[PDB]
Design a protein around this nucleic acid. Structure first.
Lengths: 93, 90, 109, 98, 80, 133, 75, 74
DNA sequence: TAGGGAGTAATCCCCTTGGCGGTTAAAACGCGGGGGACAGCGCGTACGTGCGTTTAAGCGGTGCTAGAGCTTGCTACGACCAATTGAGCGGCCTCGGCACCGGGATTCTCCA
DNA sequence: TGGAGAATCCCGGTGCCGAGGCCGCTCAATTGGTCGTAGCAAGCTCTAGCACCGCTTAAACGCACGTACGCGCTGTCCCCCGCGTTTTAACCGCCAAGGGGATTACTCCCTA
């Protein structure tokens, strides 16, 4: 059983462009992108924890990884949307 | 070869308180580095001797407690057996 | 027993916080994984997926195509000053190149 | 008398065709044999998935296309329209690759 | 066998056209063949180690992808 | 402070025992040299040859290490999924092996006095770039 | 407050750096170009070193913060 | 190569835009300078190749721009 | 004492490599000429060298206080696991996007 | 400027095939409870980062002055383009092989 973000990429697609589709060949690039950016954030989050001698990947690790890894206005909107999601999560359960 | 060789000269031009001060800086910097090494070593002395006592107490508890505890007790020294623990002990 | 509410639904995300939690654990990134780290990360993954897909959906429309082809993803990335910083060393299968001729090569007037 | 375009006209038509397209420019079977020929010197009776060689065309053609762009800049920096082997050698050497 | 000569002059031409190159010295074709072989050797060498350390006889696309990412030349589309 | 002084004293005892162990080994080697000189020198020659082979293997390793960066990353997947000794042996052979000579030493084997390109460029004299003359 | 300190890499300092790189002759337009190149590099290493310093909740940027920031520019 | 105090003021000046009242270790300043010296020395070496290409002896800003663009920094 | 692991060879499905044939399209071969590579030349200006000035970097010295770095105490929280289900994967289906074709229209080149 | 022709556009027609949606199941995500701990909060030390002052000199800088090198300009040619002919071998199809691997058979002896 092989796991792919394709179902989640397609749900994001219908938010940004309800009319627009994607090819499975382009979806493979999107799935490759999501895996590659997950790996890059998680790897820097791992290093950030290790550098500080902390056993836990916290959200503070993810936030600092995103500020290290992403450039400019992507970093600022990414940090925004993450903090919003964590807040809505905590307010629910 | 000094007989077989011939040498052609192109034209050229060629040209204590500081020596004590340099020697003072060299002496002081050298001594300070030795002080840093000695402090590092003496720091390592207490740490590694206590780590040896830490390993020894793990061995003592391993040897005292039931044989089922041996690996789990020596795992307090992150090592499976004394055949491994003796390596870092040495 | 209360009915399950997926951790994505509680965060509002489309991306799967539960899977993202597992993968942070399975990957041995650290000994422990706080409950918020999968939520923060999955939100960032959903953002960056949305950024690239809007620009690629534009490029598809600009070429009268309803489907994003790998061409449209490469165009979207290389035309964007920040996606081309993020992906500046990434090669895209069937992406091609930006149409770009050095002006000195065009016929002289 | 039949028409004939000026030197450099069809070069630009060819640039504008290949920068618009995405299909692979090296032939498939000649590249498979190059891959298997290379692989033989590492380990006998290796196999490659079709996707493994197709993944490997895409990597190397992008490497060559990307190198030519850097060498073209080295040519026009020498005020030449013509790329020459020392342009390849300069580009790779600046890249730390030669 | 010398299948590097199967990378013909027109194929090298088209790669240069997509690279935006107008005039090509006839000495480029031998230099480009040397460049390609040196690159393609390095990737296959790295890929075969993933294949063998996975105890496989078949080299897989992800072996190639890991070899490429190891070389800093990350390729999207063939897998995550 | 006494516990800190104890750590200093403990190492001092280990230092003294180390020096005693080295001195005891020296005392044995003294009598081995005085009594078994030919065997004793043949030991040092064979030890030098071993140390030379070990250094050549280490020098070859230092040439193999970093010959291709991905050597490390390739091998790491298998898991996932002498200088002073040679000099000391040479110095003892120079001291007591009357058949040994400095031209045998690695020091001589790297001396400019044994290099053809120094003769070609600078002749029999030593050269220094400090002299403008 | 500090301003205009980029002029503190003097022209002879650029010469020393350039001759160490083997450069024989240096257009006067190199000086303002090299200052622009230095500052754009140094801003990136400082930005990441400060991002590490904030993560530790420190007020002091440490040599290890520089090392991690340089290691990231290596990537 | 660069003088210490003016480079020190340069790195503090840059830091103001990222966080006010940052402290810097004496060792952190040197790790930055030695990296900047090594970066610039290693770049002029690539501009000189661009100047010895195209037959010149004199490096031009056009050479820095080509060296940086092929290093991938542009 | 027995159970299940070690050895081995037959059985049979999956799948990658290799050959045959055609045929057809792309690579190879020829050759005229053009224009771009490149050598050779003139000038001028722009950059390296030198000398007198200044400026401020660097070293030795004093004083202060922030904050890195360490120890202590506890509870919050994430690891852990047994029970429950529904989200998401693998298989199957179909229709509509897109390509590929053909022929008529507009653009672009190049020579007069 | 004009023109002819060759190259590119666009418009409509045809097809196919892959994307998007549907259905079964499962298994991996979620609910609920326990237990350890780890990292967060307080408190102490004192480390080294910051600020300031005064002297030394050696590095910087303004300007004189040349000549060494950048670049436009001319000539040549040769060698790479563009286009027509010849040839080859890349691509496709279809069958073959066998080779590997997982399941099944049955004795023998370790080990619990």
């Amino acid at each position: 059983r092989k796991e792919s973000y394709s179902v989640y990429v397609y749900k994001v697609l219908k938010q940004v462009h309800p009319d627009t589709g994607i090819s499975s060949k382009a979806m493979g690039i999107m799935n490759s992108f999501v895996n590659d950016i997950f790996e890059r954030i998680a790897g820097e989050a791992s290093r950030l924890a290790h550098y500080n001698k902390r056993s836990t990947i916290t959200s503070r690790e993810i936030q600092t990884a995103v500020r290290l890894l992403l450039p400019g206005e992507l970093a600022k909107h990414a940090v925004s949307e993450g903090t919003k999601a964590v807040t809505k999560y905590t307010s629910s359960k | 070869l000094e007989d077989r060789e011939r040498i052609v000269q192109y034209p050229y031009t060629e040209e204590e308180e500081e020596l004590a001060r340099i020697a003072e800086r060299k002496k002081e910097s050298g001594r300070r580095l030795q002080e840093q090494a000695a402090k590092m070593r003496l720091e390592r002395l207490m740490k590694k001797e206590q780590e040896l006592e830490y390993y020894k107490d793990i061995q003592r508890r391993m040897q005292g407690e039931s044989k089922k505890e041996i690996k789990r007790l020596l795992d307090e020294a992150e090592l499976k057996d004394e055949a491994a623990l003796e390596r870092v002990i040495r | 027993r209360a009915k399950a509410k997926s951790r994505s639904s509680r965060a509002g995300l489309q991306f799967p916080v539960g899977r993202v939690h597992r993968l942070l654990r399975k990957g041995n990134y650290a000994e422990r994984v706080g409950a918020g780290a999968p939520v923060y990360l999955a939100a960032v993954l959903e953002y960056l997926t949305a950024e690239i897909l809007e620009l690629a959906g534009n490029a598809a429309r600009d070429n009268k195509k309803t489907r994003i082809i790998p061409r449209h993803l490469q165009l979207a990335i290389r035309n964007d000053e920040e996606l081309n910083k993020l992906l500046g060393r990434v090669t895209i299968a069937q992406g091609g190149v930006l149409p770009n001729i050095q002006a000195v090569l065009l016929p002289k007037k | 008398k039949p028409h004939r375009y000026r030197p450099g006209t069809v070069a630009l038509r060819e640039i504008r065709r290949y920068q618009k397209s995405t299909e692979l420019l090296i032939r498939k079977l000649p590249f498979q044999r190059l891959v298997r020929e290379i692989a033989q010197d590492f380990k006998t009776d290796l196999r490659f998935q079709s996707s493994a060689v197709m993944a490997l065309q895409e990597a190397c053609e992008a490497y060559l296309v990307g190198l030519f762009e850097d060498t073209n800049l080295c040519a026009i920096h020498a005020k030449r329209v013509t790329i020459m082997p020392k342009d390849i050698q300069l580009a790779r050497r600046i890249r730390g690759e030669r | 066998r010398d299948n590097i000569q199967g990378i013909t002059k027109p194929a090298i031409r088209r790669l240069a056209r997509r690279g935006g190159v107008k005039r090509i010295s006839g000495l480029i074709y031998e230099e480009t063949r040397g460049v390609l072989k040196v690159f393609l050797e390095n990737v296959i060498r790295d890929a075969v180690t993933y294949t063998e350390h996975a105890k496989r006889k078949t080299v897989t696309a992800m072996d190639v992808v890991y070899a490429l990412k190891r070389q800093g030349r990350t390729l999207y589309g063939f897998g995550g | 402070l006494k516990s800190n002084w104890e750590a200093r004293q403990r190492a001092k005892a280990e230092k003294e025992a180390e020096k005693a162990r080295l001195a005891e080994e020296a005392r044995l080697d003294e009598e081995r040299r005085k009594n078994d000189l030919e065997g004793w020198l043949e030991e040092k020659r064979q030890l030098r040859l071993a140390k030379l082979n070990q250094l050549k293997e280490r020098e070859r390793l230092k040439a193999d290490l970093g010959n291709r960066k991905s050597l490390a990353s390739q091998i790491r997947m298998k898991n996932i999924a002498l200088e002073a000794a040679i000099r000391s042996l040479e110095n003892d052979l120079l001291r007591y092996d009357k058949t040994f000579s400095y031209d045998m030493t690695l020091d001589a084997q790297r001396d400019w006095s044994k290099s053809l390109l120094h003769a070609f460029r600078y002749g029999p004299r030593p050269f220094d770039p400090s002299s403008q003359a």
